[PDB]
Coordinates of C-alpha atoms and ligand atoms in Angstrom, one line a residue:
Chain A
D3 CA 8.9 -40.8 0.6
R4 CA 12.2 -39.6 2.2
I5 CA 15.5 -41.5 2.1
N6 CA 18.1 -41.4 4.9
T7 CA 21.4 -40.3 4.2
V8 CA 24.4 -39.5 6.2
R9 CA 23.6 -35.9 6.2
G10 CA 19.8 -36.6 7.0
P11 CA 16.6 -37.3 5.1
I12 CA 16.4 -36.1 1.5
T13 CA 13.5 -36.3 -0.9
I14 CA 13.3 -38.8 -3.9
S15 CA 13.9 -36.0 -6.4
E16 CA 17.1 -35.1 -4.8
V17 CA 18.6 -38.7 -5.3
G18 CA 19.4 -38.3 -8.8
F19 CA 21.9 -40.5 -10.6
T20 CA 22.8 -43.1 -8.2
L21 CA 25.5 -45.8 -7.7
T22 CA 23.9 -48.6 -5.6
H23 CA 27.0 -50.7 -4.7
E24 CA 29.9 -48.6 -3.3
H25 CA 32.1 -48.0 -0.3
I26 CA 34.5 -45.4 1.0
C27 CA 36.7 -47.7 2.7
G28 CA 36.8 -51.6 3.0
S29 CA 38.0 -52.5 6.5
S30 CA 37.2 -54.0 9.9
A31 CA 35.2 -52.4 12.7
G32 CA 37.5 -49.9 14.5
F33 CA 40.4 -50.3 12.3
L34 CA 40.4 -47.1 10.9
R35 CA 40.4 -45.5 14.5
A36 CA 43.0 -47.8 15.7
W37 CA 45.6 -47.6 12.7
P38 CA 44.9 -44.8 10.6
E39 CA 48.4 -45.0 9.4
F40 CA 47.6 -47.8 7.5
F41 CA 46.0 -45.6 5.0
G42 CA 48.8 -43.0 5.3
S43 CA 46.5 -41.1 7.6
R44 CA 42.9 -40.5 8.2
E45 CA 43.4 -37.0 6.4
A46 CA 45.0 -38.7 3.4
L47 CA 42.0 -40.9 3.1
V48 CA 39.5 -38.2 3.4
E49 CA 41.3 -36.4 0.6
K50 CA 41.5 -39.0 -1.8
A51 CA 37.9 -40.0 -1.0
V52 CA 36.8 -36.4 -1.5
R53 CA 38.6 -36.1 -4.8
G54 CA 37.2 -39.3 -6.2
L55 CA 33.7 -38.5 -5.2
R56 CA 33.9 -35.1 -6.8
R57 CA 35.2 -36.7 -9.9
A58 CA 32.3 -38.9 -10.1
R59 CA 30.0 -36.0 -9.3
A60 CA 31.3 -34.1 -12.1
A61 CA 30.4 -37.2 -14.4
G62 CA 26.8 -36.7 -13.3
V63 CA 26.6 -39.0 -10.0
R64 CA 24.4 -37.3 -7.3
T65 CA 24.1 -40.3 -4.7
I66 CA 26.1 -43.2 -3.7
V67 CA 24.9 -46.1 -1.5
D68 CA 27.8 -47.1 0.7
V69 CA 27.1 -50.8 1.3
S70 CA 30.0 -51.2 4.0
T71 CA 28.5 -52.8 7.3
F72 CA 29.8 -52.8 10.9
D73 CA 32.2 -55.6 10.0
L74 CA 33.5 -54.1 6.9
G75 CA 34.5 -51.2 9.2
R76 CA 32.0 -48.7 8.2
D77 CA 32.8 -45.3 10.0
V78 CA 29.6 -43.2 9.4
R79 CA 31.7 -40.1 10.5
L80 CA 34.1 -40.4 7.6
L81 CA 31.1 -40.8 5.4
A82 CA 29.6 -37.7 6.7
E83 CA 32.9 -35.7 6.2
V84 CA 33.2 -37.1 2.7
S85 CA 29.7 -36.5 1.7
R86 CA 29.8 -32.8 3.1
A87 CA 33.1 -32.0 1.1
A88 CA 32.2 -33.7 -2.1
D89 CA 28.4 -32.6 -2.2
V90 CA 27.3 -36.2 -3.1
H91 CA 24.5 -37.9 -1.0
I92 CA 25.7 -41.1 0.8
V93 CA 23.3 -43.7 2.0
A94 CA 24.7 -45.9 4.8
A95 CA 24.1 -49.4 5.3
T96 CA 23.4 -52.0 8.4
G97 CA 23.7 -55.8 8.0
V98 CA 26.6 -58.2 7.9
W99 CA 29.3 -59.0 5.4
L100 CA 31.8 -62.0 5.4
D101 CA 33.9 -61.2 8.4
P102 CA 31.3 -60.9 11.7
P103 CA 33.3 -60.8 14.8
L104 CA 32.2 -63.3 17.6
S105 CA 29.9 -60.6 19.4
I106 CA 27.9 -60.9 16.0
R107 CA 28.3 -64.4 15.1
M108 CA 27.1 -65.5 18.3
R109 CA 24.0 -64.0 18.1
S110 CA 20.3 -65.4 17.4
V111 CA 18.1 -64.2 14.6
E112 CA 16.1 -62.2 17.0
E113 CA 19.0 -60.5 18.3
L114 CA 20.5 -59.7 14.6
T115 CA 17.1 -58.2 13.9
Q116 CA 17.4 -55.6 16.9
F117 CA 20.7 -54.7 15.8
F118 CA 19.7 -54.1 12.3
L119 CA 16.5 -52.1 13.4
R120 CA 18.7 -49.9 16.0
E121 CA 20.9 -48.8 12.8
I122 CA 17.8 -48.1 10.9
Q123 CA 15.6 -46.4 13.2
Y124 CA 17.6 -45.0 15.9
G125 CA 21.1 -44.4 14.4
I126 CA 24.5 -45.8 13.9
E127 CA 26.6 -45.5 17.0
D128 CA 26.2 -42.4 18.7
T129 CA 25.6 -40.2 15.5
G130 CA 21.9 -40.1 15.0
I131 CA 22.8 -41.3 11.3
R132 CA 20.1 -43.9 10.2
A133 CA 20.9 -46.6 7.8
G134 CA 19.1 -46.6 4.6
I135 CA 19.8 -50.1 3.3
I136 CA 20.5 -53.5 4.6
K137 CA 23.7 -55.4 3.1
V138 CA 24.0 -59.3 3.2
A139 CA 27.0 -61.5 2.0
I140 CA 26.9 -65.4 1.8
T141 CA 29.2 -67.8 0.7
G142 CA 28.7 -70.4 -2.0
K143 CA 26.2 -72.6 -0.1
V144 CA 24.5 -70.3 2.6
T145 CA 25.9 -71.5 6.2
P146 CA 23.5 -71.7 9.2
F147 CA 24.6 -68.4 10.5
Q148 CA 24.4 -66.6 7.0
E149 CA 20.6 -68.0 7.0
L150 CA 20.1 -66.2 10.3
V151 CA 21.5 -63.2 8.9
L152 CA 19.2 -63.2 5.7
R153 CA 16.1 -63.8 7.8
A154 CA 17.1 -60.9 10.3
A155 CA 17.4 -58.7 7.0
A156 CA 14.2 -59.8 6.0
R157 CA 12.6 -59.0 9.2
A158 CA 14.2 -55.6 9.7
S159 CA 13.1 -54.8 6.1
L160 CA 9.6 -55.7 6.7
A161 CA 9.6 -53.3 9.7
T162 CA 11.1 -50.6 8.2
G163 CA 10.7 -50.6 4.4
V164 CA 14.3 -50.3 3.7
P165 CA 15.6 -52.6 0.9
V166 CA 18.1 -55.5 1.1
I167 CA 21.1 -56.0 -1.2
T168 CA 22.9 -59.4 -1.3
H169 CA 25.7 -61.1 -3.1
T170 CA 27.4 -64.6 -3.2
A171 CA 30.9 -64.8 -2.8
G172 CA 32.9 -67.6 -4.4
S173 CA 30.0 -68.8 -6.7
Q174 CA 28.5 -67.3 -10.0
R175 CA 24.8 -68.0 -8.9
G176 CA 23.4 -68.3 -5.4
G177 CA 20.8 -65.9 -5.8
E178 CA 18.2 -68.8 -5.8
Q179 CA 19.2 -69.8 -2.2
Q180 CA 18.9 -66.2 -0.9
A181 CA 15.5 -65.8 -2.9
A182 CA 14.0 -68.8 -1.2
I183 CA 14.9 -67.5 2.4
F184 CA 13.7 -63.9 1.6
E185 CA 10.4 -65.5 0.2
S186 CA 9.9 -67.8 3.1
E187 CA 9.8 -64.7 5.5
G188 CA 7.4 -62.9 3.5
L189 CA 9.6 -60.3 1.8
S190 CA 8.8 -58.9 -1.5
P191 CA 11.3 -59.5 -4.3
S192 CA 10.9 -55.7 -5.1
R193 CA 12.8 -55.0 -1.9
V194 CA 15.8 -57.2 -2.8
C195 CA 18.6 -56.5 -5.1
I196 CA 20.7 -59.8 -6.1
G197 CA 24.2 -58.1 -6.5
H198 CA 27.5 -59.1 -8.2
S199 CA 25.2 -60.5 -10.9
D200 CA 27.6 -59.4 -13.7
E201 CA 29.9 -62.2 -12.2
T202 CA 27.9 -65.0 -14.2
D203 CA 27.3 -64.9 -18.0
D204 CA 24.0 -67.3 -17.4
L205 CA 21.5 -65.0 -18.6
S206 CA 18.5 -67.3 -18.3
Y207 CA 19.2 -67.5 -14.3
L208 CA 19.3 -63.7 -14.3
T209 CA 16.0 -63.3 -16.6
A210 CA 14.5 -65.8 -14.1
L211 CA 15.2 -63.6 -11.1
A212 CA 14.0 -60.4 -13.0
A213 CA 10.7 -62.1 -13.8
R214 CA 10.0 -62.9 -10.1
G215 CA 10.5 -59.3 -9.1
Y216 CA 14.1 -59.2 -8.0
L217 CA 16.4 -56.3 -8.8
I218 CA 19.5 -57.4 -10.5
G219 CA 22.7 -55.6 -9.4
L220 CA 25.4 -55.6 -12.3
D221 CA 27.7 -53.7 -10.0
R222 CA 31.3 -55.3 -10.3
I223 CA 31.8 -54.1 -13.9
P224 CA 35.2 -52.6 -13.6
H225 CA 36.4 -55.6 -11.7
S226 CA 37.0 -57.8 -14.6
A227 CA 40.6 -57.1 -14.5
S244 CA 36.3 -58.1 -20.1
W245 CA 34.1 -55.1 -18.9
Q246 CA 32.4 -54.7 -22.1
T247 CA 31.1 -58.3 -21.9
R248 CA 29.7 -57.7 -18.4
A249 CA 28.1 -54.3 -19.7
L250 CA 26.4 -56.3 -22.3
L251 CA 24.4 -58.1 -19.9
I252 CA 22.8 -54.7 -19.2
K253 CA 21.8 -54.6 -22.8
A254 CA 20.8 -58.3 -22.7
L255 CA 18.2 -57.6 -19.8
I256 CA 16.8 -54.5 -21.4
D257 CA 15.9 -56.7 -24.6
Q258 CA 14.3 -59.0 -22.5
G259 CA 12.1 -56.4 -21.2
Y260 CA 13.4 -55.8 -17.6
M261 CA 14.8 -52.4 -17.7
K262 CA 13.0 -51.6 -14.5
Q263 CA 14.8 -54.3 -12.8
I264 CA 18.6 -53.2 -13.4
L265 CA 21.0 -51.5 -10.9
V266 CA 24.4 -50.7 -12.0
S267 CA 27.4 -49.8 -9.9
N268 CA 31.1 -50.2 -9.7
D269 CA 31.7 -51.6 -6.3
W270 CA 34.8 -49.3 -5.7
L271 CA 36.3 -47.9 -2.8
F272 CA 39.2 -45.6 -1.8
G273 CA 41.0 -47.7 0.7
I274 CA 41.0 -51.3 1.7
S275 CA 42.8 -53.0 4.5
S276 CA 40.8 -56.3 4.6
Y277 CA 43.0 -58.0 2.0
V278 CA 46.7 -57.7 1.0
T279 CA 48.6 -54.5 1.8
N280 CA 48.6 -52.1 -1.0
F281 CA 45.7 -54.2 -2.9
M282 CA 44.3 -50.3 -3.4
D283 CA 47.4 -49.6 -5.8
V284 CA 46.5 -52.8 -7.9
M285 CA 42.6 -51.9 -8.3
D286 CA 43.6 -48.2 -8.9
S287 CA 46.1 -49.4 -11.7
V288 CA 43.1 -51.3 -13.4
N289 CA 40.6 -48.9 -13.1
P290 CA 42.1 -45.3 -12.7
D291 CA 38.6 -43.8 -13.2
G292 CA 37.2 -45.1 -9.9
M293 CA 33.5 -44.6 -9.3
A294 CA 33.5 -42.5 -12.4
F295 CA 33.8 -45.7 -14.4
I296 CA 29.9 -46.4 -14.8
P297 CA 29.2 -42.8 -16.1
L298 CA 32.2 -42.2 -18.1
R299 CA 32.6 -45.7 -19.8
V300 CA 29.7 -48.0 -19.4
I301 CA 26.9 -45.4 -20.2
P302 CA 28.6 -44.1 -23.3
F303 CA 29.3 -47.6 -24.5
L304 CA 25.7 -48.6 -23.8
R305 CA 24.6 -45.4 -25.7
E306 CA 26.9 -46.5 -28.6
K307 CA 25.2 -49.8 -28.8
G308 CA 21.6 -48.2 -29.4
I309 CA 20.3 -47.9 -25.8
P310 CA 18.1 -44.7 -25.7
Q311 CA 18.8 -41.9 -23.2
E312 CA 15.6 -42.4 -21.6
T313 CA 16.3 -46.1 -20.8
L314 CA 19.7 -45.1 -19.4
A315 CA 18.2 -42.3 -17.3
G316 CA 15.5 -45.0 -16.0
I317 CA 18.3 -47.4 -15.0
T318 CA 20.6 -44.8 -13.3
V319 CA 17.8 -42.6 -11.8
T320 CA 14.3 -44.1 -11.7
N321 CA 15.2 -47.5 -10.6
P322 CA 17.7 -46.5 -7.7
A323 CA 15.1 -44.0 -6.2
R324 CA 12.2 -46.6 -6.4
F325 CA 14.5 -49.2 -4.9
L326 CA 15.7 -46.8 -2.0
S327 CA 12.3 -45.4 -1.0
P328 CA 11.3 -47.1 1.9
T329 CA 8.1 -49.1 1.0
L330 CA 6.5 -51.4 3.2
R331 CA 3.7 -52.2 0.8
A332 CA 5.4 -53.4 -2.5
Chain B
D3 CA 60.9 -47.2 34.2
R4 CA 57.4 -45.8 35.3
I5 CA 54.3 -47.9 34.2
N6 CA 51.8 -46.5 31.8
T7 CA 48.1 -46.7 33.0
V8 CA 45.1 -45.2 31.3
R9 CA 45.4 -42.2 33.6
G10 CA 49.0 -41.8 32.8
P11 CA 52.3 -43.0 34.1
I12 CA 52.9 -44.2 37.7
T13 CA 55.9 -45.2 39.5
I14 CA 56.4 -48.7 40.8
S15 CA 55.7 -47.8 44.3
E16 CA 52.2 -46.6 43.5
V17 CA 51.3 -50.2 41.7
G18 CA 50.3 -52.0 45.0
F19 CA 48.3 -55.1 45.1
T20 CA 47.8 -55.9 41.5
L21 CA 45.4 -58.3 39.6
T22 CA 47.5 -59.2 36.5
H23 CA 44.8 -60.6 34.2
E24 CA 41.3 -58.9 34.1
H25 CA 38.8 -57.2 31.7
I26 CA 36.3 -54.5 31.9
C27 CA 34.4 -55.8 28.9
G28 CA 35.1 -58.9 26.7
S29 CA 33.7 -57.9 23.3
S30 CA 34.6 -57.3 19.7
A31 CA 36.5 -54.3 18.2
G32 CA 33.7 -51.4 17.7
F33 CA 30.6 -53.4 19.3
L34 CA 30.3 -51.4 22.5
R35 CA 30.1 -48.3 20.4
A36 CA 27.8 -50.0 17.8
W37 CA 25.4 -51.7 20.1
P38 CA 25.6 -50.4 23.5
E39 CA 22.1 -51.6 24.4
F40 CA 23.5 -55.2 24.2
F41 CA 24.9 -54.4 27.7
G42 CA 21.8 -52.6 28.7
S43 CA 23.5 -49.2 28.0
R44 CA 27.0 -47.8 28.2
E45 CA 26.0 -46.0 31.4
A46 CA 24.8 -49.4 33.1
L47 CA 28.1 -51.0 32.0
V48 CA 30.1 -48.2 33.3
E49 CA 28.1 -48.1 36.8
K50 CA 28.6 -51.8 37.1
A51 CA 32.0 -51.7 36.5
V52 CA 32.5 -48.9 38.9
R53 CA 30.8 -50.5 41.7
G54 CA 32.7 -53.7 41.2
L55 CA 36.2 -52.1 41.0
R56 CA 35.2 -50.2 44.2
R57 CA 34.6 -53.3 46.1
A58 CA 37.7 -54.7 44.6
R59 CA 39.4 -51.3 46.0
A60 CA 38.0 -51.7 49.4
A61 CA 39.2 -55.4 49.6
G62 CA 42.8 -54.0 48.9
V63 CA 43.3 -54.0 45.1
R64 CA 45.1 -51.0 43.7
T65 CA 45.9 -52.1 40.1
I66 CA 44.5 -54.2 37.5
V67 CA 45.9 -55.1 34.1
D68 CA 43.0 -55.1 31.4
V69 CA 44.3 -57.6 28.9
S70 CA 41.6 -56.7 26.4
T71 CA 43.1 -56.2 22.9
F72 CA 41.6 -54.4 19.8
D73 CA 40.0 -57.6 18.6
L74 CA 38.6 -58.4 22.1
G75 CA 36.7 -55.1 22.0
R76 CA 39.1 -52.8 24.1
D77 CA 37.4 -49.4 24.5
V78 CA 40.2 -47.5 26.2
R79 CA 37.9 -44.5 26.7
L80 CA 35.7 -47.0 29.0
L81 CA 38.8 -48.1 30.7
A82 CA 39.8 -44.4 31.6
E83 CA 36.2 -43.5 32.7
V84 CA 36.0 -46.7 35.1
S85 CA 39.7 -46.3 36.5
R86 CA 39.0 -42.6 37.2
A87 CA 35.4 -43.3 38.9
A88 CA 36.7 -46.2 41.0
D89 CA 40.3 -44.6 41.6
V90 CA 42.0 -47.8 40.7
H91 CA 45.0 -48.1 38.3
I92 CA 44.2 -49.9 35.1
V93 CA 47.0 -51.1 32.6
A94 CA 46.1 -51.2 29.1
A95 CA 46.9 -53.7 26.5
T96 CA 48.0 -54.1 22.9
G97 CA 48.3 -57.3 21.1
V98 CA 46.1 -59.9 19.1
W99 CA 43.5 -62.2 20.8
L100 CA 41.6 -65.2 19.2
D101 CA 39.3 -63.3 16.9
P102 CA 41.3 -61.0 14.6
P103 CA 39.4 -59.6 11.7
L104 CA 40.7 -59.7 8.3
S105 CA 42.4 -56.0 8.6
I106 CA 44.6 -57.7 11.5
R107 CA 44.9 -61.3 10.2
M108 CA 46.2 -60.3 6.8
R109 CA 49.0 -58.5 8.0
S110 CA 52.6 -59.5 8.1
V111 CA 54.9 -59.9 11.2
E112 CA 56.7 -56.4 10.4
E113 CA 53.1 -54.8 10.1
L114 CA 52.0 -56.3 13.3
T115 CA 55.2 -55.1 15.1
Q116 CA 54.5 -51.5 13.8
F117 CA 50.9 -51.6 15.2
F118 CA 52.0 -52.8 18.7
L119 CA 54.8 -50.3 18.7
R120 CA 52.0 -47.6 17.9
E121 CA 50.0 -48.6 20.8
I122 CA 52.9 -49.0 23.2
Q123 CA 55.0 -45.9 22.1
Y124 CA 52.4 -43.4 20.7
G125 CA 49.0 -44.3 22.1
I126 CA 45.8 -46.2 21.5
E127 CA 43.5 -44.7 18.7
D128 CA 43.4 -40.8 19.1
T129 CA 43.5 -40.8 22.9
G130 CA 47.2 -40.7 23.8
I131 CA 46.7 -43.5 26.2
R132 CA 49.7 -45.9 25.9
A133 CA 49.8 -49.8 26.3
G134 CA 51.6 -51.1 29.1
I135 CA 51.6 -54.9 28.3
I136 CA 51.1 -57.0 25.1
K137 CA 48.4 -59.8 25.3
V138 CA 48.5 -62.7 22.8
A139 CA 46.2 -65.7 22.7
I140 CA 47.0 -69.0 20.8
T141 CA 45.0 -72.3 20.3
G142 CA 46.1 -75.6 21.0
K143 CA 48.8 -76.1 18.2
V144 CA 50.2 -72.5 17.4
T145 CA 48.9 -71.5 14.0
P146 CA 51.0 -69.7 11.2
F147 CA 49.3 -66.4 11.9
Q148 CA 49.7 -67.0 15.5
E149 CA 53.3 -67.4 15.3
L150 CA 53.5 -64.2 13.4
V151 CA 51.7 -62.3 16.3
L152 CA 54.1 -64.1 19.0
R153 CA 57.1 -62.9 17.0
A154 CA 55.7 -59.3 16.6
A155 CA 55.0 -59.3 20.5
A156 CA 58.5 -60.3 21.1
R157 CA 59.9 -57.7 18.7
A158 CA 57.8 -55.0 20.4
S159 CA 58.7 -56.0 23.9
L160 CA 62.6 -56.0 23.1
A161 CA 62.1 -52.6 21.6
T162 CA 60.1 -51.1 24.4
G163 CA 60.8 -53.2 27.5
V164 CA 56.9 -53.8 28.0
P165 CA 56.2 -57.4 29.1
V166 CA 54.0 -60.0 27.3
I167 CA 51.1 -62.0 28.7
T168 CA 49.9 -65.2 26.7
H169 CA 47.2 -67.8 27.0
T170 CA 46.2 -71.1 25.1
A171 CA 42.6 -71.6 24.4
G172 CA 41.2 -74.6 26.4
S173 CA 42.9 -76.4 29.1
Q174 CA 45.6 -77.0 26.7
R175 CA 49.2 -76.5 28.0
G176 CA 51.0 -74.3 25.4
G177 CA 53.7 -72.5 27.2
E178 CA 56.2 -74.6 26.1
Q179 CA 55.6 -74.1 22.2
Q180 CA 55.0 -70.3 23.0
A181 CA 58.3 -70.2 24.9
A182 CA 60.3 -71.6 22.0
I183 CA 59.2 -68.9 19.8
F184 CA 59.8 -66.2 22.1
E185 CA 63.4 -67.2 23.0
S186 CA 64.0 -67.7 19.1
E187 CA 63.6 -64.1 19.2
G188 CA 65.8 -63.3 21.9
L189 CA 63.1 -62.4 24.6
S190 CA 63.8 -62.9 28.2
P191 CA 61.6 -65.2 30.0
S192 CA 61.2 -62.6 32.7
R193 CA 59.2 -60.5 30.3
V194 CA 56.7 -63.4 29.7
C195 CA 53.8 -64.6 31.8
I196 CA 52.2 -67.9 30.8
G197 CA 48.7 -67.0 31.6
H198 CA 45.8 -69.3 32.5
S199 CA 48.3 -71.7 33.8
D200 CA 45.8 -72.7 36.3
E201 CA 43.9 -74.9 33.8
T202 CA 46.2 -77.7 34.5
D203 CA 47.4 -79.7 37.6
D204 CA 50.5 -80.7 35.6
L205 CA 52.9 -79.4 38.4
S206 CA 55.8 -80.8 36.2
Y207 CA 54.9 -78.5 33.4
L208 CA 54.3 -75.4 35.7
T209 CA 57.7 -75.7 37.6
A210 CA 59.8 -76.1 34.6
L211 CA 58.4 -73.2 33.0
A212 CA 59.0 -71.3 36.4
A213 CA 62.6 -72.7 36.6
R214 CA 63.5 -70.9 33.3
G215 CA 62.3 -67.6 34.6
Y216 CA 58.7 -67.4 33.2
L217 CA 56.1 -65.9 35.3
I218 CA 53.1 -68.5 35.8
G219 CA 49.7 -66.8 35.6
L220 CA 47.3 -68.5 38.1
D221 CA 44.8 -66.1 37.1
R222 CA 41.3 -67.8 36.6
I223 CA 41.0 -69.0 40.2
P224 CA 37.1 -68.3 40.6
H225 CA 36.4 -69.9 37.2
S226 CA 34.4 -73.1 38.1
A227 CA 31.2 -74.6 36.9
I228 CA 30.6 -77.0 39.6
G229 CA 26.7 -77.1 40.3
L230 CA 26.0 -75.8 36.9
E231 CA 26.7 -79.1 35.2
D232 CA 23.2 -78.7 33.3
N233 CA 24.7 -75.6 31.8
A234 CA 27.2 -76.7 28.9
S235 CA 28.3 -73.5 28.1
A236 CA 29.3 -72.7 31.5
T237 CA 31.3 -76.1 31.9
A238 CA 33.2 -75.4 28.5
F239 CA 34.1 -71.7 29.6
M240 CA 34.8 -72.3 33.3
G241 CA 35.9 -75.8 33.7
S242 CA 34.9 -78.5 36.3
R243 CA 37.8 -77.8 38.9
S244 CA 36.8 -76.3 42.1
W245 CA 38.5 -72.8 43.0
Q246 CA 40.4 -74.3 45.8
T247 CA 42.0 -76.7 43.3
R248 CA 43.2 -73.8 41.1
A249 CA 44.5 -71.9 44.3
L250 CA 46.4 -74.8 45.6
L251 CA 48.5 -74.6 42.7
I252 CA 49.8 -71.3 44.3
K253 CA 50.7 -73.2 47.2
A254 CA 52.4 -76.1 45.5
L255 CA 54.5 -73.6 43.5
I256 CA 55.7 -71.8 46.6
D257 CA 56.5 -74.9 48.2
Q258 CA 58.9 -75.8 45.1
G259 CA 60.7 -72.4 45.8
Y260 CA 59.0 -70.4 42.8
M261 CA 57.2 -67.8 44.9
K262 CA 58.8 -65.0 42.8
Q263 CA 57.4 -66.7 39.5
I264 CA 53.8 -66.4 40.5
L265 CA 51.1 -63.9 39.3
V266 CA 47.2 -64.1 40.5
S267 CA 43.9 -62.9 39.1
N268 CA 40.5 -63.6 38.6
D269 CA 40.0 -63.2 34.9
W270 CA 36.8 -61.4 35.5
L271 CA 35.0 -58.9 33.5
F272 CA 31.6 -56.8 33.9
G273 CA 30.3 -57.6 30.3
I274 CA 30.6 -60.0 27.6
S275 CA 29.4 -60.2 24.3
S276 CA 31.9 -62.7 22.6
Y277 CA 30.2 -65.7 23.9
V278 CA 26.6 -66.7 24.8
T279 CA 24.0 -64.2 25.6
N280 CA 23.5 -63.4 29.2
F281 CA 26.8 -65.2 30.1
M282 CA 27.7 -62.4 32.4
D283 CA 24.8 -63.7 34.7
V284 CA 26.0 -67.2 34.8
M285 CA 29.5 -65.6 35.9
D286 CA 28.1 -63.3 38.4
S287 CA 26.0 -66.3 40.0
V288 CA 29.2 -68.5 40.4
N289 CA 31.1 -65.5 41.9
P290 CA 29.3 -62.7 43.1
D291 CA 32.6 -61.3 44.6
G292 CA 33.6 -60.5 41.2
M293 CA 37.3 -59.2 41.2
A294 CA 37.3 -58.8 45.0
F295 CA 37.3 -62.9 45.0
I296 CA 41.2 -63.0 45.1
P297 CA 41.6 -60.5 48.2
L298 CA 38.6 -61.7 50.0
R299 CA 38.5 -65.6 49.3
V300 CA 41.9 -66.8 48.1
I301 CA 44.3 -64.8 50.2
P302 CA 42.6 -66.2 53.6
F303 CA 42.5 -69.7 52.1
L304 CA 46.3 -69.5 51.5
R305 CA 46.9 -68.2 54.8
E306 CA 44.8 -70.8 56.4
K307 CA 47.0 -73.2 54.4
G308 CA 50.0 -72.0 56.2
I309 CA 51.6 -69.5 53.6
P310 CA 53.0 -66.5 55.4
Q311 CA 51.6 -63.1 54.9
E312 CA 54.9 -61.7 53.6
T313 CA 55.0 -64.4 50.9
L314 CA 51.5 -63.3 49.7
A315 CA 52.4 -59.7 49.6
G316 CA 55.3 -60.7 47.5
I317 CA 53.1 -62.6 45.1
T318 CA 50.5 -59.8 44.9
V319 CA 52.6 -56.8 45.1
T320 CA 56.2 -57.2 44.4
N321 CA 56.1 -59.6 41.4
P322 CA 53.5 -57.5 39.4
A323 CA 55.5 -54.5 39.7
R324 CA 58.8 -56.5 38.6
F325 CA 56.9 -57.7 35.7
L326 CA 55.1 -54.6 34.6
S327 CA 58.1 -52.4 35.0
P328 CA 59.5 -52.2 31.6
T329 CA 63.0 -53.4 31.6
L330 CA 64.7 -54.4 28.4
Ligands
CL401 CL1 30.1 -55.6 0.1
CL402 CL1 41.8 -62.8 27.4
EU3_403 EU1 31.5 -54.6 -2.1

C-alpha cells in the first residue's frame, strides 16, 4: 500500500529504518503558536529538531512516527518543515493523549470517531496532511472517558486500516485492559502496538500479548535515567520466537512544555544522543549479544512497514 | 490611553455602548482550527456571528469585550474577521480560564506574568493584535494555581494599565477572596470587574464590593433555564432565576448610589464546544435576541422601572470606557 506522511504518501519500500514512537515537540494545543518564546523561538526549535533528525538519519533512520496528538500540541506545519529540511519521513498521528481539553473530553464515542476520521481521511487542520497512526494514552485503571477513546480509535482503525499505538501511564502493565476493549470492538491485534512495554520486566505478560498477535513497543529505552536491562527484553522476546512482533523507539523530542520548565535540559543531559540512541547504542549492543543483522533489520525495517501499511484485512 | 481592539487602537470617544463580557466562540485552544465541522464550518460560524453582531449594532451596540482566553479557544483571527464584517469594535483578552492545559498550569507566577505581558504589549500569536483586558476564572475556593494566575494578572495590569475581569464558577460569591489577593499585589479595585455577579441576590455582598471601588459585572442577564427544567444541562449552566431578577440587581445597585460601579452584558456567544453538544441551540431557544438582549429588552425594562436614560447611558457607555482605558 502507501503510507501517509507530512510530505504526502510514500511507498512501503521508501519507509526504511523507522522509529515508531517519537515526537518533535511535547506541548499543548495552540501553545507553540501562542508562546514560541517558551522554546527560545520557533526558529530555535526548528533548528534543534532539524539537527537532531539529521543526526538520526546519518545513523540510518529514514522515517519517524510522531505520535503527538492534538492535545499534546501536535503542529503539523512544524513537522512538515523539519521533515523537508532533515530529509526524514514523518508520519503524523491523531488520537487523544493524557490532557484533553473540555472540547474533547465532553465528546461522545461517535464524535471522537468522526474527529479521528477527519484527521485520517481529510487532513489535519487546513493542511491536507493526513494522519497515519492513532495514538491513545490511558492511566492505570482505564477511566470511562479513556474507554470511549479506545473504542473510537478501534472504530477509526477499522474504517481506514491505520494502526493504533497505546500506552499505560503510571502502571507497568495495563495492556490487558486495552486488549480487552480493542477485541470487543473487532479490532485485529496486528493493528495494535502496546507501547512503553519496556517499562515492565514481567516477560511472561509481554510474551502472552505477543502470542495473541499484539505488537510490543519497546520504545522508552533511553528513559531509564538501566537501558541495557530494557534492551535485553528485545533479545528475550526474539528468543521466544516473536521477533516479528517487536517495535523499538526512543520516545524522544526536541522541546517540551507540558512538564517543568527546562525539563528538556534534563533529558538532553541523560541522553545526548537523542533519537540516535536506538541506532547508535541499542542496535550495536544487540549485535554484540549475538542477534543477527537479519533479525535486527526485520525489527527496524520490516516490522514498522507491516505495522504502518494500512491494512483493513489482517 | 487609547484602547487596543482586534482592528487596532481606538480612542475612548469611539467605544460607545459596550457589552463588557461576551465571546464569539467558547471552545478550547486549537479546536476551531482542528475540527471546524463541529460548528458546521468555520464559514458558518463566521456568518452566524456576523449576523448576530450586526443585529446588536442595529440595536446600538458599538463595542464588545470578548473575554475568551487561550484555553477557552480564543481565535483572534476569527475575532478580527467578525469585528470587521460587522463593523463592531472587539476587545480581545489574555489570561487563564478554567481549563488550562499542562503547558499553562505547570507555569510559575513569573512565567504567567510574562505570557500575559506578551499578549498585551507585543501581540497574540503572530498577529500583532494586542489584548486589552485580562480574564481570570476561579472555582469556589481559589486553588493554588488560580492564586498564581490572579497574582500574575495583577502584576501584568500594574505594568500595562490594562484592567482585569474575573468570575467564579457556579453561583459562588468569590469576589472577596479574589479582591484580597489583588490588593495584596497593590492593584487598584477600579481596575477589577467582579464578573457574573448577577448569579447571586446577596445585595450586601455586591454593595460592599462596589463601595471599595470594584466594578460589578451584572453580565449574564439573559441566562435563565426557566421552562427548561427537563434539561438538566441547561439548569446547571444558566440557572433558575428569571432575567428580570438579574436585571433588578442593576436597579438595586443604582438605588444604593453605585451606578458608577456597574457593568452590564449578556455573556453570549455564537458557538460553544466546551460543554454538551448542541448547547448552542438550547441557548438560542432561550434568548433568540442573542447579544441584542441588553439593548432591546433590559434597557427598556429598566426605563419602565423608572431609571433615567442618563443613568442607563452612564452604565452602558461611561463606565465601560473608564474601565477599559489603561490607567495604572
Ligand atoms: Cl505519547
Ligand atoms: Cl468566560
Ligand atoms: Eu510519548
